[PDB]
Amino acid sequence: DAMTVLTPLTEKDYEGLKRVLRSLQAHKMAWPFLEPVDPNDAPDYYGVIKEPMDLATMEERVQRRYYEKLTEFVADMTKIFDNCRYYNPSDSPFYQCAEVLESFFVQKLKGFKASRSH
Amino acid sequence: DAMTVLTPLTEKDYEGLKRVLRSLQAHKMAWPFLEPVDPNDAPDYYGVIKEPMDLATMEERVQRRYYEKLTEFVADMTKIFDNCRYYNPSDSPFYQCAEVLESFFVQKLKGFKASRSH
Amino acid sequence: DAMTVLTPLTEKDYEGLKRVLRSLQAHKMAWPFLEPVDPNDAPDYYGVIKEPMDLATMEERVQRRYYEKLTEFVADMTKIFDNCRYYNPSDSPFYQCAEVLESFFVQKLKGFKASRSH
Amino acid sequence: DAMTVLTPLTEKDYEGLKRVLRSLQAHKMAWPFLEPVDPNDAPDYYGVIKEPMDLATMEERVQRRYYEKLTEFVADMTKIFDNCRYYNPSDSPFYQCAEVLESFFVQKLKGFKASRSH
Amino acid sequence: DAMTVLTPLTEKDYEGLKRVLRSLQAHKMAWPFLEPVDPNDAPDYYGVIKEPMDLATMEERVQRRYYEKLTEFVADMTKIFDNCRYYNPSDSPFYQCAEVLESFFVQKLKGFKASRSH
Amino acid sequence: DAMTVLTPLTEKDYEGLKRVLRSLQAHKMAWPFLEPVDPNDAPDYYGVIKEPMDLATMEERVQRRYYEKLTEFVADMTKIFDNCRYYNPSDSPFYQCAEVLESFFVQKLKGFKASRSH
Ligand SMILES: CN1C[C@H](Nc2nc3c(c(=O)n2C)CCC3)C[C@H](c2ccccc2)C1
Ligand SMILES: CN1C[C@H](Nc2nc3c(c(=O)n2C)CCC3)C[C@H](c2ccccc2)C1
Ligand SMILES: CN1C[C@H](Nc2nc3c(c(=O)n2C)CCC3)C[C@H](c2ccccc2)C1
Ligand SMILES: CN1C[C@H](Nc2nc3c(c(=O)n2C)CCC3)C[C@H](c2ccccc2)C1
Ligand SMILES: CN1C[C@H](Nc2nc3c(c(=O)n2C)CCC3)C[C@H](c2ccccc2)C1
Ligand SMILES: CN1C[C@H](Nc2nc3c(c(=O)n2C)CCC3)C[C@H](c2ccccc2)C1
């Protein structure tokens, strides 16, 4: 979509970004992405993931208006999952929780790209 | 079913394992993972992706009958697309090809799991 | 076709002209042509394109009844795509989008050069 | 296609860049694109057209091994057809010859894009 | 002057017009402006100058009694020198020739205005 | 003058180039040239004038020591006036302001050429 790349993010938009973000935080499968990875559960995590991400941190950025474009937002989200699938094994819960939450996200994202324009 | 996990791969199994692979080798979108990553293109690749995977390397492995359970061949397949979304940017052509191939694989693999049980 | 050049435009015709225009304004790939180019996007545009055109300026015209023959309407349409391809790079979005819609409008117009003879 | 944008043009490539070019110089409708637009035919042309092109200027460029990728060769071909539809009227001969000849180039170009994959 | 704008040109007017014009055609430096710019000298000229002009085209216009007010005769003359300084480099002879000739025109034009105001 | 063409610009030179440029911005008739032309005032301006210019861009350039010779500096100035006279009517004020200011600059420039040598 044109507008996703090009049309910048208004106060209205950011309002509905917080709305989507909260939906993720209340999701049943979000339990592994609400906060940052603990370096004690996994030394080498921050050493082998170049750009880690969580919803705790995406909440900061949505409240600090970090994202000039809907594009910078959908990147940082997809980090959460691409990073989770990369570091964990295909048969782990952490992986499954990411596959589920990403599908959900896309739906909650599809509704936001639609409600922007018409 | 997941007799995927438990039921060793027989010879007729390895049949559609090779056929499913030819079909990924055909795809117009398979080009990015037909062969191993060249480290002239990307020096730091091999140092930052832990278990690289191509389809050439995987095709060898279907010839050595490297795989005792279907579980193993699908781990190694999904490596390719997880490595790719990890290493590249989301709006990348590579990243789009992994998104598209994998969905293909998944439909071609859905077929295989059913043409094993009944 | 003879009918397009000499037989002029009935009150009917002008209904199925506004109806095709409508169809182009729906399309997914019509987004770059629904209104006039902005001069702040492109300060040289209006000085180097001799006859710009948009579906908004064309809805005005179809309504005002500006077009005596069908030849006139299809010119003003084709300005939109030839101007685009001229001013924008072959490999660009705007360009690709013009390709999609000229291809479409053609068939949506083949269906009008046929509802005007039987 | 990935190969078109990224694979550098070998000398075998260039051999049958000359074939595609001469097959176009042969065409029955290629006649108005063989040589540069004459300033006496159209005093404004070279002022109102930012980058003119022709098959002769491109025969020179294809001989002097000027094109690093296939991407650059098709860009200059489609200039001939974009500059033409832009400058001339939709109902002019020159305009139809670009319609006819580009459409043909496109097929010669399909056949060369697959002569390369293998 | 009020007269130059408002007082229509009569026959004795048009006779001073022709005297002024020939004085210019005589000038040591009128040479670049005696006739239309040749598109073979400068392919882009006619496409990048919206209203070219010459002392020849104007001598026709003075014979045809084309000018209703002195205002329009002066306008078309200042086109010659404006279009020349615009198109050409300032250190060029054509640029210098317009600088000189116009200053000449101006003294001759002054004369003509008081040869009128009585 | 020899010195204007050949003798590069010292730090002292540049001091008095800003001195002159200031004087221009002081002038009551500088008002149409103090900053760049607005594309919304005039959509075609930037597409049909090839090298625009303004005292604001010229201040930047004098502060970046962009001009090796007094010759480049005086060109860029004279764009402002030639561009104005070309795009606008002889009888317009923008035109009449270009005239007045250009005459001024010449005088201020006369004095700067003279303050260089003795
Ligand atoms: C901080 N801590 C991070 C956890 N999330 C996570 N930890 C690791 C990886 C990973 O990919 N993720 C997504 C790879 C390495 C370790 C979720 C966890 C949690 C535990 C119990 C009840 C709810 C939540 C809290
Ligand atoms: C062998 N060589 C490997 C390339 N594939 C690839 N290169 C890189 C990454 C990646 O993720 N991939 C999948 C990240 C870093 C660089 C594809 C390339 C190729 C070019 C044109 C037509 C087909 C194939 C050939
Ligand atoms: C009005 N404004 C005009 C744009 N269209 C356009 N702009 C330019 C060219 C061109 O060829 N086109 C078609 C070349 C020069 C710049 C479309 C744009 C738009 C942005 C976001 C979402 C929808 C629409 C809005
Ligand atoms: C050199 N001269 C150029 C002509 N081609 C051309 N002239 C013009 C435009 C244009 O778009 N084209 C393509 C717009 C402005 C005039 C073709 C002409 C020719 C005549 C007969 C047999 C072959 C060739 C040769
Ligand atoms: C017809 N042809 C036109 C020339 N004049 C001219 N050519 C150009 C520009 C321009 O500004 N001018 C005034 C800019 C673009 C090229 C003068 C030329 C001539 C040469 C020698 C002796 C007398 C006449 C005759
Ligand atoms: C930025 N904006 C540019 C204007 N200057 C200008 N605009 C145009 C042309 C031109 O030639 N000039 C010199 C032709 C095309 C439109 C002057 C204007 C202004 C208005 C009031 C008080 C001071 C300044 C400011």
Swiss-Prot record, chains A, B, C, D, E, F:
Tissues of expression: Ubiquitously expressed, with highest levels in testis. Present in kidney, liver and brain. In the brain, highest levels are found in motor cortex (at protein level).
Modifications made to the protein after synthesis: Phosphorylation enhances DNA-binding.
Cystine connections: none
Localisation per UniProt entry: Cytoplasm; Nucleus
Domain Bromo: 8-112
Function: Regulatory subunit of the ATP-dependent NURF-1 and NURF-5 ISWI chromatin remodeling complexes, which form ordered nucleosome arrays on chromatin and facilitate access to DNA during DNA-templated processes such as DNA replication, transcription, and repair. The NURF-1 ISWI chromatin remodeling complex has a lower ATP hydrolysis rate than the NURF-5 ISWI chromatin remodeling complex. Within the NURF-1 ISWI chromatin-remodeling complex, binds to the promoters of En1 and En2 to positively regulate their expression and promote brain development.
Disease: Neurodevelopmental disorder with dysmorphic facies and distal limb anomalies: An autosomal dominant neurodevelopmental disorder characterized by variable degrees of developmental delay, intellectual disability, speech delay, postnatal microcephaly, dysmorphic features, and mild abnormalities of the hands and feet.
Family: Belongs to the PBTF family.
Subunit structure: Interacts with MAZ. Interacts with KEAP1. Component of the NURF-1 ISWI chromatin remodeling complex (also called the nucleosome-remodeling factor (NURF) complex) at least composed of SMARCA1 (isoform 2), BPTF, RBBP4 and RBBP7. Within the complex interacts with isoform 2 of SMARCA1. Component of the BPFT-SMARCA1 complex at least composed of SMARCA1 (isoform 1), BPFT, RBBP4 and RBBP7; the complex is catalytically inactive and does not remodel chromatin. Within the complex interacts with isoform 1 of SMARCA1.
Domain notes: The second PHD-type zinc finger mediates binding to histone H3K4Me3.
Protein name: Nucleosome-remodeling factor subunit BPTF
Source organism per UniProt: Homo sapiens
Lineage, broadest ranks: Eukaryota, Metazoa, Chordata, Craniata, Vertebrata
Name of the gene: BPTF
Segment of the intact protein contained: 2920 to 3037 of 3046
